[PDB]
From Swiss-Prot, chain B:
The keyword Transport applies. The lineage of its organism: Eukaryota, Metazoa, Chordata, Craniata, Vertebrata. Transmembrane segments: none annotated. WD repeats lie at residues 7-56, 71-109, 126-165, 169-207, 214-254, 258-291. This is Nucleoporin Nup43. One of its GO terms (cellular component) is nuclear pore outer ring. The keyword Ion transport does not apply. It comes from Homo sapiens (Human). Its main location: nucleus. Component of the Nup107-160 subcomplex of the nuclear pore complex (NPC). The Nup107-160 subcomplex includes NUP160, NUP133, NUP107, NUP98, NUP85, NUP43, NUP37, SEH1 and SEC13. Component of the Nup107-160 subcomplex of the nuclear pore complex (NPC). The Nup107-160 subcomplex is required for the assembly of a functional NPC. The Nup107-160 subcomplex is also required for normal kinetochore microtubule attachment, mitotic progression and chromosome segregation. GO terms for biological process: cell division; chromosome segregation; mRNA transport; nucleocytoplasmic transport; protein transport.
Curated annotation (Swiss-Prot), chain C:
The gene is NUP85. It comes from the Eukaryota. The chain holds residues 2 to 219 of 656 of the full protein. It comes from Homo sapiens. Essential component of the nuclear pore complex (NPC) that seems to be required for NPC assembly and maintenance. As part of the NPC Nup107-160 subcomplex plays a role in RNA export and in tethering NUP96/Nup98 and NUP153 to the nucleus. The Nup107-160 complex seems to be required for spindle assembly during mitosis. NUP85 is required for membrane clustering of CCL2-activated CCR2. Seems to be involved in CCR2-mediated chemotaxis of monocytes and may link activated CCR2 to the phosphatidyl-inositol 3-kinase-Rac-lammellipodium protrusion cascade. Involved in nephrogenesis. Belongs to the nucleoporin Nup85 family. This is Nuclear pore complex protein Nup85. The modification N6-acetyllysine is found at K91. Signal peptide: none annotated.
Swiss-Prot record, chain D:
Component of nuclear pore complex. It comes from Homo sapiens (Human). It comes from the Eukaryota. It is linked to Fetal akinesia deformation sequence 4: A clinically and genetically heterogeneous group of disorders with congenital malformations related to impaired fetal movement. Clinical features include fetal akinesia, intrauterine growth retardation, polyhydramnios, arthrogryposis, pulmonary hypoplasia, craniofacial abnormalities, and cryptorchidism. FADS4 inheritance is autosomal recessive. This is Nuclear pore complex protein Nup88. Interacts with NUP214/CAN. Interacts with NUP62 and NUP98. Ubiquitous.
UniProtKB/Swiss-Prot annotation, chain E:
This is Nuclear pore complex protein Nup214. It is found in: Nucleus, Nuclear pore complex. Expressed in thymus, spleen, bone marrow, kidney, brain and testis, but hardly in all other tissues or in whole embryos during development. The lineage of its organism: Eukaryota, Metazoa, Chordata, Craniata, Vertebrata. Probably glycosylated as it reacts with wheat germ agglutinin (WGA). Disulfide bonds: none annotated. Contains FG repeats. FG repeats are interaction sites for karyopherins (importins, exportins) and form probably an affinity gradient, guiding the transport proteins unidirectionally with their cargo through the NPC. FG repeat regions are highly flexible and lack ordered secondary structure. The overall conservation of FG repeats regarding exact sequence, spacing, and repeat unit length is limited. It comes from the Eukaryota.
Amino acid sequence: LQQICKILNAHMDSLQWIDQNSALLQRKVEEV
Amino acid sequence: EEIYAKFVSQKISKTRWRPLPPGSLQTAETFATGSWDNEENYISLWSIGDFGNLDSDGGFEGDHQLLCDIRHHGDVMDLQFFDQERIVAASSTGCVTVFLHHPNNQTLSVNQQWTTAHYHTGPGSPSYSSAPCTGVVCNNPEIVTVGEDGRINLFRADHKEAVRTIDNADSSTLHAVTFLRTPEILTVNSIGQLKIWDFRQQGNEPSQILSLTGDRVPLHCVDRHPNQQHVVATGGQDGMLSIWDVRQGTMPVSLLKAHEAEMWEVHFHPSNPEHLFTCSEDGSLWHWDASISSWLSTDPAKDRIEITSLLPSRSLSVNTLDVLGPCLVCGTDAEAIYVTRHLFS
Amino acid sequence: EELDGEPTVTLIPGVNSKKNQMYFDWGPGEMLVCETSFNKKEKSEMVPSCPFIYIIRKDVDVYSQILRKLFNESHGIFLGLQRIDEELTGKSRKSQLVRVSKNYRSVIRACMEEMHQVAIAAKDPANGRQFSSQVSILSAMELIWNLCEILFIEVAPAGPLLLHLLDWVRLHVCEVDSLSADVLGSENPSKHDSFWNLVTILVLQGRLDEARQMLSKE
Amino acid sequence: MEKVLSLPKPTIILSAYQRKCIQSILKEEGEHIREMVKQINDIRNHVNF
Amino acid sequence: VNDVLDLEWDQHLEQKKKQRHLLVPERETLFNTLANNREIINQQRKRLNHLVDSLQQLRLYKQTSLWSLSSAVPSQSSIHSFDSDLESLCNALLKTT
């Protein structure tokens, strides 16, 4: 279960990184 | 709603609800059954399974749980609660047994037994033969029973002997019995008669007789309206339902076709008694609603009785029913029991 | 031809067949047997044996106390079968007869694993072996019925027939999921000695994304 | 808190099929996340400003 | 530090309350978090596809072709779901026809 939690956390980091880049590209498409 | 059937691997001759505490708000939580025709017959206490939950691990806990049992001797011909811990049963051995439940242990035990309540006699010696005890009715401290011997007994739940016996109250079988008024009972027989008996009278003769007109239809079952001590319902060998006012002549007031076979029990609803229920050897179970009381109309094509088959197909025989509040139970020769918690939904 | 083995041999306790003759009669489910010996004491101090009567009930196994469930629950399904209309079309009736088949299988299963718990609860290993033997008979019945259902009642066509036959094996060859629990419960599943046996057996059952998940622990 | 530690807790044994379920789902969702990262980097490589 | 220590102690008082009326929350936090993660995955995926649609409308991105994945689920073991799998297979076969 501690291994499952480590995987879930590593997915939440990667999804926060996805949100911050999906938003950055969205501003860069609203800019142009 | 749906009716929850359970197989039990014994034929059920009788079922009864456990009487609720005076002024409780509970539904009927517990019932008792008796069995017949096995290599071993029993009396068993059951709790209705709780169809409202799932726990985390996904099991169906909604089954009717067996609380406890006890082995019987003969067949359970008739069954009644005497209070909240004691049960009385008849037997095809002619025996009558009082049992006791032990809630702290979940067991049954014998409490008292009359091993020779019903018996056939022969010429000149006390070599008695077994006579099936057919019906039992209780009026605490008091108990009455009938049988193939045509005997009526009056027993008590503090006394070991009979308080009174009436031998040869009929030359045929007596089937069932009910209390009109406390010293005053009514019985039914193989001839198609209702016989009324007063335990105050010092002869053995019936206080009054009622019958059908001429044709012999055996009357297997009887009940007497909860608010009207003069209104009686009986069931025939043909599948007819007969309503009587025992004060008004010799005949039924209302005669209704209820079945295509022998009608094994009839009951008025214990709180809603303009409702009635019946079971039979045609494999059907019926509810009747009729809301002078509607049961005493001579024209059932004017005053409405609406009539509902509760079972979704004809089983093997439905020997018995009982109804308490919104709950109903019945028992069958398909080695199975049927229960609802809701009859008005 | 049929019945070309030895005729089924019941052993009767005490009875001394080794020279003693017998008399018998037929009741509705029980046959009586009695033996022609009576022991008129040649001077020995021992109790003389009376003759004995034996009540010999039919082998049709109706008297295993669990199987009363099987007979009543299947009679309810048999009256659920003789009440099927013949004009019910070859899709409605076929689906309903596939339900009747699966109802009967459910009763075999619900008698078998009740009897499996009774075999585990058997406080003498002789009684536990008697229940375990009748569990193996109910398993053979549900194995044959699961095949006869696929071939004759559902009548599986080419293609689906292989899917039907894969879970046919799986619902009886339950060895694999038991082995899966022990291998997966270990501190290092890819280092339980049976791990590679289980990886192969999951491929022999066609359970390929389950075999892929075991291979992921390597 | 310390005075409460002296009766056992029941070990929550996830079945060897329910452990497989969660591992399979964490694989499906882990691979979908890789595809979204790949797709965002490929657009970032194609839309240079 | 005092507000975290009051929060941990309100949660200790709540766990010690919860204990006095029976079993099973710990199964559901795991699955309700997996349900949320998979929804966040579907949300970002839909947002990224709308960004690709916008870049294709603007002629700033031209594309070839890509694909995407599918799920699976395992079974119960302990003895009472046969008719549910057989009804799931019979409804499957009826929808093949």
